[PDB]
């Protein structure tokens, strides 16, 4: 069913949080 | 840069393209026929040689 | 007054390649006039002599003059 | 000839971004048609397909070449069926012509 | 068949490299005391001198130094007024024909456009007006003409106006006859560009603007377009 | 033969497409010449697939006299010098890769590219010096 | 030239060649089937509208 | 909103293609180049005088005294072959990748075309200089080729005996009217297409990946005007008179005939096979079927895959058109004499034998290989 | 419009925010690989018929000139 | 900085005051000194 | 066929209500009139010249030599006479017959209104009469009034310090583009 797989890295694209969110 | 880059590229370059070249070469069946034949090359060609240059 | 022009001619027919231009050139004209019934001009091979002297004078011209 | 294929096969491309030859048909009125009797199956499978195949060319990427058709697997889904669709249009069109 | 004037370093020619403007003083000179007798600069008129190489106060000098007479009088059929600033440069033949007449039956162009209606203009008009060589062997050229390799045909009525030291220039460089040629194709060109200096300042803010400008838009696309070329399809049969 | 000398007779960089159109004779020859050996000795299987290795010998070594006629030739245009002996190292540059395609691999490519290159290049300067390849005796 | 009609008119005269070897061109030598004088009442002036018919 | 109800759907929401290239770009940018060469050309006639007495001044007083009216002019020029830069580039896609089966927005094109064409004519004949004058007798009088309708028609055209102030004044009003009707064709051209939908490079059926159009295509149309604005500065504020002519700068003079006449560089490719022909007649009939030729490319379509992209014996077809049209190009402008006339011959047979006979005969061999026919 | 557009079934699809992801990722890392790899598949399908066009231009050219060069038996 | 986000961009009038403010001043440096630039470029050839 | 279809929208398979009057034909006849106006524009513009030296005598020459140019330039000025009858008697139609609840469609009509004004404006500006020059001043020199950037404003329109050949030739570019406009 859905919990088959999780969602596929996306870490290679992801950036380096609202900490950061007002940054980025 | 060293080890392999100028490696690489000069000295064992070198060892390469030949080492490919001897192995070309010398990879013959032994049969006469062959053999034969590429003398029958030689001949054309000098005959041409010759030839060419009359 | 010596035009910077006239001096960089000297030194552009100077170079070797337009020499031998030159050469050609003059041959034609004797040749052409020579020839008594003609009308082969040297034109063109006055104009072949020319690009070249043009040439090499477009590459020191322009700095000798002011 | 089977060479030739091949080779063409890889020359085309279609195969590299997960496509069998079928999935590049132009949808025409009769192709069109096949592609709906296409069994369920063939037809989600067919979709998922060409979506993965818009998405590649989006990036102007190829699949990883492994996941490459190949010249033997690729099957022709519609195929048997669109002869139908064909043979069933020229019947109705001579037919015409009586 | 044409000799093809060779390319020379203009100065103008770099891409920011505006005209002198030095120079040209020199040219216009060249032009107002050689080439005015029969060429005619229609399109130019003092006024436009004002901020190339000389200023208002200035200009009007010379305006004045010619005499304009207008027609157009109460009672009298003219009217002789030194030129203003806004007078054209004054053409000489008022009618063709005059030139004609004149000019063995040959209209000096109008120089007003002269290099931008040449083609390889600043090249041809350098090249013509200096070369005019020896005639070959063969050559018959008719009544009034002379000899010039690149002049179509190579038979140009005009006489070769620029003898060595043919003018002098006020500013005293030394008049040498490739110097007034040169001077006078920079004139030339001023004249058929008057703002070539003004536009290539507009083509380094446009060259700077875009340098800025296109990686902030192609940041803006890639930012957008991003969220596609990361989707990841998957296909999950059930 | 009046023929291949004709590539030397017109200066160099000039009327490529007869220095073209020779350079990639030669090479074919030596295509034919070169899979001749290579199916006399090492024979092939079917008469067709040397049939086969002639044409592929022929065509890689038409194809390296191709490029490296027209990348001499052109690089010379260009240039503006049609007796810099960098020219011809360019074009046997480019022959060397030609060759290194057609073997499918980057690392010919490179060795092919020196040595080619520099080969022709010395052809270059040969005929430049005037320096005599097979001299009759003369002592 | 004189540009009658806007067409610029040529009203040429022609050399004593041009006048006497016009006729010369026989026949099948002349491309069109015309002949040289009927262009011309007087074979030393040659009137013509001045565009070449091609184009 | 009625208003909203166009817009929205039309310019935000159109379900685009996610794959199609900067290709689709080019299209956007003809209609951006339209509105520039309309207002460019609203600036200049507020200046322009049609009379042929005034007109060269009219137009010297534009890049003299008007201000940055040397500005307007030029990149009134240079946007007009920025125009046909972009036109040729969008008819190439469309050949490319079969967006020719898109039948009526392909009508609507061809037609488009050849009132850009009948425009750029017109406006090229407006600034009354040498080039001008020689260039509108010229082709005016191809014409003249029609035996019995032809003549009457010229001069009707010309107004008169022979081009004057009677062809200047009405040519000033057709190159003012055209581009409005070309606008109109655009707004045509757009519905025609919106009722099928953009085609993709894959010249497959995109309906499973389309997404909207506001973010995703309207900033790539946004940076591809961009560049297109960077190309076309950079050709009239650095090299403004690289595409021009100088012949152009001399005033039209009826008595003498600029030594050496050619086209604009757009209009070559058909000089080339009107020169080709040697019967008059037969070069302008070529001539137009050489633009016609396009619209006749719907009923040539004989492969069962709409584009090009998997099609290899038809993707050198296709260069080798694009490389002898490139020929037709350079031929135009080379002068009657050996040997450009036999590549001309040649170049000309070429385009019409690979359009006519050789595409469809490869596509019918394509579809042999993938064990379709 | 959208909704009506085509039917699709269990193909699913994720995605990231833009402000999460890193505008260029890899930029120069694949993009030359990969613009060279694109490179290689068109190239000779492309350039040999523009390169036979520099041929016949070139080809042209000089047979111009050469036909313009004077017969030397000419006027002799 | 989140002061610029928090303070200029948040709000989306800020954050076009910003731009409207930043083309004021904009204009005025970018002339200036492209201006010099170009008068540097041709140092020697000019009216003055 | 999707231009067919906006056609029989819009011309043939439109609902209109049976018992509208005469009245109702005033609207289309403004269409009409619209398209008379640019045709018999495009065949004044074959022969206008927009210089002040020549616009009379390019006028009386359209009147005197061009064959039925007559016709055509009093076919032009009587349309604009025929186009704002038309025109007042639809808006006397619209206040009358309540039809301004229609508030977008009134809208776009009194900006249609105000374009037409002002396109017959210089276009009564364009045969540079003596009535035309002094008209063209006066309603220019109304725009002087603005408060503050009136001066400017006049000045821009003009081309310069009073109207003169600046202001005919822009005057015809305008006049020539604003009726397409007012078809959009
Ligand atoms: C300074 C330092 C510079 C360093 C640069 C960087 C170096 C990197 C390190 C080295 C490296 O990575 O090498 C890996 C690389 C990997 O390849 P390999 O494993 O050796 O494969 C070779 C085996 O023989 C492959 O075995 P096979 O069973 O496939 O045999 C087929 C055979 C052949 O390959 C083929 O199957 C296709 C056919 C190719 C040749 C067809 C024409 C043959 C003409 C013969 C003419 C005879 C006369 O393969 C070869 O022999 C390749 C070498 C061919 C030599 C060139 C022959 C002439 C061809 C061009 C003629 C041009 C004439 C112009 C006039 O090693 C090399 O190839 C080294 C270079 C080999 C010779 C290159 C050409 C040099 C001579 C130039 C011409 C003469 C000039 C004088
Ligand atoms: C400028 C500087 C140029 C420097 C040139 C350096 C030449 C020598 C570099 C090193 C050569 C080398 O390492 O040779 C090893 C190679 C293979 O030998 P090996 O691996 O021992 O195998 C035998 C046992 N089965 O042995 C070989 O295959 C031959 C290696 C080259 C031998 C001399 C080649 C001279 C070529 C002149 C042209
Ligand atoms: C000079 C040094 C040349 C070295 C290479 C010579 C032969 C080159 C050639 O064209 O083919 C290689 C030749 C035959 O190919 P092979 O090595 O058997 O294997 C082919 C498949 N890999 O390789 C061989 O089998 C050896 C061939 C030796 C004889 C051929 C070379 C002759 C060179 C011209 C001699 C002219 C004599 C005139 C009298
Ligand atoms: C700006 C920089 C310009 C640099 C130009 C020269 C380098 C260009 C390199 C381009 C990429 C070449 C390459 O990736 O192939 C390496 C080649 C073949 O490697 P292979 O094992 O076949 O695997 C390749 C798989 N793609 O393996 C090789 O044979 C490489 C041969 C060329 C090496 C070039 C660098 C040599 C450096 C020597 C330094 C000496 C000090
Ligand atoms: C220039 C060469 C540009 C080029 O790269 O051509 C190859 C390109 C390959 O594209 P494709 O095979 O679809 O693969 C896409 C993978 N993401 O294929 C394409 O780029 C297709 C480009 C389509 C538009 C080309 C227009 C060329 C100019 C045509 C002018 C004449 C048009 C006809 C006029 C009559
Ligand atoms: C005293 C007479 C006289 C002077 C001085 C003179 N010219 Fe001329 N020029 C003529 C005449 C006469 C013609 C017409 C010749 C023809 O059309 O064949 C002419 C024609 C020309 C042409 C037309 C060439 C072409 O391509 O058709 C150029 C360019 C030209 N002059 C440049 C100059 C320049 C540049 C100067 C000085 C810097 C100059 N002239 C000074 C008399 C003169
Ligand atoms: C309705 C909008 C347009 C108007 C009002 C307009 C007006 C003008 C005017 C007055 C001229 C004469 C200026 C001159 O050439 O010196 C002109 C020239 C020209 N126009 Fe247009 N034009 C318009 C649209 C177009 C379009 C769409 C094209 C392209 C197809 C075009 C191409 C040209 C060209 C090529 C010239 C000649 C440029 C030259 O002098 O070399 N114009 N235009
Ligand atoms: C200057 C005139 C033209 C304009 C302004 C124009 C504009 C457009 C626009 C805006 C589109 C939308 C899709 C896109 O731009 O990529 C389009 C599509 C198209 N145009 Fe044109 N076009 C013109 C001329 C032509 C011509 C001459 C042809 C035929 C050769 C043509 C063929 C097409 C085709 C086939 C499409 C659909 C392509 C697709 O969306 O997949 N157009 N046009
Ligand atoms: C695009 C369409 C139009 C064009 C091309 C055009 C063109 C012209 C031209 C060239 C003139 C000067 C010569 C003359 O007609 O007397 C003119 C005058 C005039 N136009 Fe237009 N016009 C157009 C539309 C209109 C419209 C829609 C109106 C009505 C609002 C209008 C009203 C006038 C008037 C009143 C005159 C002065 C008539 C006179 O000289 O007595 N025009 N027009
Ligand atoms: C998503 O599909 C569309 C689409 O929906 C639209 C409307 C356009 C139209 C886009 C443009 C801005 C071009 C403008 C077209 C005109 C009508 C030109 C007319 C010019 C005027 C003077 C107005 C597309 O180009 C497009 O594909 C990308
Ligand atoms: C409700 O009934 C209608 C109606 O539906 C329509 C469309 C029109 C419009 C038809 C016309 C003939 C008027 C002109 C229409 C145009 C779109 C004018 C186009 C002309 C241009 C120059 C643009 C009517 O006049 C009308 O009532 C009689």
């Known amino acids: 069913s859905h919990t088959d797989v999780k969602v596929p890295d996306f870490s290679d694209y992801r950036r380096a949080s609202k900490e950061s969110s007002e940054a980025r | 840069l060293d080890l392999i880059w100028l490696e690489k590229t000069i000295p064992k370059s070198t060892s390469t393209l030949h080492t490919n070249m001897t192995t070309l070469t010398t990879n013959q069946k032994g049969l006469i026929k062959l053999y034969f034949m590429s003398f029958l090359i030689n001949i054309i060609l000098i005959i041409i040689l010759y030839s060419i240059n009359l | 007054l010596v035009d910077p022009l006239t001096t960089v001619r000297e030194h552009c027919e100077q170079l070797e390649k337009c020499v031998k231009a030159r050469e050609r050139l003059e041959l034609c004209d004797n040749r052409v006039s020579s020839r008594s019934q003609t009308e082969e001009d040297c034109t063109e091979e006055l104009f072949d002599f020319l690009h070249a002297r043009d040439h090499c004078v477009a590459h020191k011209l322009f700095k000798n003059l002011k | 000839l089977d060479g030739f294929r091949k080779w063409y096969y890889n020359a085309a491309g279609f195969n590299k971004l997960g496509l069998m030859r079928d999935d590049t048909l132009h949808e025409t009125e009769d192709v069109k048609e096949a592609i709906r009797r296409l069994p369920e199956d063939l037809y989600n499978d067919r979709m998922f397909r060409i979506k993965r195949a818009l998405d590649l060319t989006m990036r102007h990427q190829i699949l990883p070449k492994d996941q490459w058709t190949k010249y033997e697997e690729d099957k022709f889904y519609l195929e048997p069926y669109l002869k139908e669709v064909i043979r069933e249009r020229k019947e109705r069109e001579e037919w015409a012509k009586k | ?238 | 033969k009046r023929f291949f000398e004709s590539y030397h007779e017109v200066p160099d960089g000039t009327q490529c497409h007869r220095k073209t159109y020779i350079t990639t004779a030669l090479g074919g020859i030596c295509g034919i010449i070169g899979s001749a050996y290579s199916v006399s000795l090492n024979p092939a299987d079917s008469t067709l697939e040397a049939v086969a290795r002639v044409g592929r010998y022929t065509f890689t070594a038409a194809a390296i006299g191709a490029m490296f006629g027209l990348t001499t030739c052109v690089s010379a245009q260009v240039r503006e010098k049609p007796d810099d002996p960098l020219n011809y190292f360019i074009g046997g540059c480019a022959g060397g890769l030609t060759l290194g395609a057609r073997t499918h691999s980057y690392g010919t490519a490179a060795m092919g590219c020196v040595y080619m290159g520099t080969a022709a290049a010395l052809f270059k300067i040969g005929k430049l010096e005037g320096w005599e390849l097979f001299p009759t005796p003369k002592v | 030239a004189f540009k009658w009609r806007g067409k610029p008119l040529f009203v040429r005269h022609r050399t004593k060649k041009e006048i006497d070897q016009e006729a010369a061109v026989e026949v099948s030598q002349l491309r069109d089937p015309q002949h040289d004088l009927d262009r011309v009442k007087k074979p030393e002036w040659v009137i013509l509208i001045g565009v070449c018919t091609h184009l | 909103h009625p208003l909203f109800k166009i817009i929205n759907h039309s310019f935000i929401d159109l379900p685009a293609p996610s794959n199609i290239s900067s290709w689709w770009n080019f299209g956007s940018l003809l209609g951006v180049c339209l509105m520039v060469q309309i207002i460019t050309g609203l600036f200049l006639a507020m200046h322009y005088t049609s009379d042929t007495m005034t007109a060269f001044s009219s137009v010297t007083h534009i890049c003299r005294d008007v201000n940055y009216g040397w500005l307007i002019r030029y990149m009134h020029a240079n946007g007009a072959s920025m125009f046909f830069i972009c036109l040729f580039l969008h008819v190439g896609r469309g050949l490319y990748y079969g967006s020719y089966t898109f039948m009526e927005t392909w009508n609507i094109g061809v037609l488009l075309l050849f009132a850009v064409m009948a425009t750029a004519f017109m406006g090229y004949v407006l600034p009354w200089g040498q080039m001008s004058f020689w260039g509108a007798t010229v082709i005016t009088n191809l014409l003249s080729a029609i035996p019995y309708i032809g003549t009457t028609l010229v001069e009707w055209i010309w107004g008169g005996f022979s081009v004057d102030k009677a062809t200047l004044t009405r040519f000033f009003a057709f190159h003012f009217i055209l581009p409005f009707i070309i606008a109109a064709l655009a707004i045509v051209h757009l519905l025609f297409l919106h009722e099928t939908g953009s085609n993709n490079p894959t010249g497959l059926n995109s309906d499973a990946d389309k997404i909207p159009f506001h973010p995703y295509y309207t900033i790539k149309d946004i940076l591809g005007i961009l560049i297109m604005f960077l190309i076309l500065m950079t050709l009239v504020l650095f090299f403004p008179d690289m595409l021009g002519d100088p012949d152009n700068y001399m005033p039209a003079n009826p008595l003498n005939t600029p030594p050496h006449i050619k086209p604009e560089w757009y209009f070559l490719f058909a000089y080339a096979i009107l020169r080709s022909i040697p019967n008059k007649l037969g070069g302008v009939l070529a001539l137009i079927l050489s633009i016609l030729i396009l619209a006749l490319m719907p009923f040539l379509h004989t492969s069962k895959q709409r584009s090009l992209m998997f099609r290899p014996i038809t993707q050198i077809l296709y260069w080798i058109l694009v490389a002898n049209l490139l020929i037709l190009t350079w031929i135009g402008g080379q002068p009657v004499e050996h040997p450009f006339i036999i590549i001309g011959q040649l170049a000309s047979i070429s385009y019409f034998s690979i359009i006519l006979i050789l595409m469809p005969i490869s596509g019918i061999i394509e579809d042999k290989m993938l064990k379709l026919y | 419009e959208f909704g009506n557009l085509a039917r699709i079934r269990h193909v699913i699809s994720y995605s990231l925010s833009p402000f999460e992801q890193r505008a260029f990722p890899s930029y120069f890392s694949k993009g030359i690989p990969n613009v060279l790899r694109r490179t290689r598949e068109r190239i000779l399908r492309v350039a040999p018929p523009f390169v036979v066009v520099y041929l016949i231009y070139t080809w042209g050219n000089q047979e111009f000139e050469q036909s313009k060069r004077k017969n030397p038996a000419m006027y002799e | 900085p989140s002061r610029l986000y928090s303070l200029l961009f948040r709000r989306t009038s800020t954050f076009a005051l910003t731009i409207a403010v930043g083309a004021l001043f904009f204009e005025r440096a970018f002339d200036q000194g492209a201006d010099a630039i170009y008068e540097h470029i041709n140092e020697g050839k000019l009216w003055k």
């Open chain 5, 1 to 238: 068949l044409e000799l093809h004037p060779p390319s020379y370093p203009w100065s103008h020619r770099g891409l920011l490299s505006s005209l002198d403007h030095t120079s040209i003083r020199r040219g216009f000179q060249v032009y107002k005391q050689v080439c005015s007798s029969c060429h005619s600069m229609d399109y130019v008129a003092y006024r436009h001198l004002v901020g190339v190489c000389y200023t208002e106060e200035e200009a009007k000098a010379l305006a004045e130094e010619v005499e304009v007479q207008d027609g157009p009088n109460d009672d009298g059929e003219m009217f002789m007024r030194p030129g203003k600033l806004s007078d054209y440069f004054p053409k000489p033949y008022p009618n063709p024909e005059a030139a004609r007449a004149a000019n063995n039956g040959a209209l000096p162009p109008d120089l007003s456009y002269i290099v931008r209606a040449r083609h390889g203009g600043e090249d041809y008009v350098f090249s013509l007006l200096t070369g005019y060589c020896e005639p070959p062997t063969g050559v018959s050229l008719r009544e009034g003409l002379y000899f010039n390799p690149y002049f179509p045909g190579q038979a140009i009525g005009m006489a070769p106006p620029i003898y060595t030291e043919v003018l002098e220039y006020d500013d005293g460089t030394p008049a040498t006859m490739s110097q007034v040629a040169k001077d006078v194709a920079t004139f030339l060109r001023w004249a058929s560009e008057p703002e070539h200096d003004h536009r290539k300042r507009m083509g380094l803010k446009m060259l700077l603007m875009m340098g800025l400008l296109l990686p902030l838009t192609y940041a803006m696309k890639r930012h957008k377009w991003s969220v596609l070329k990361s989707r990841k399809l998957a296909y999950r049969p059930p």
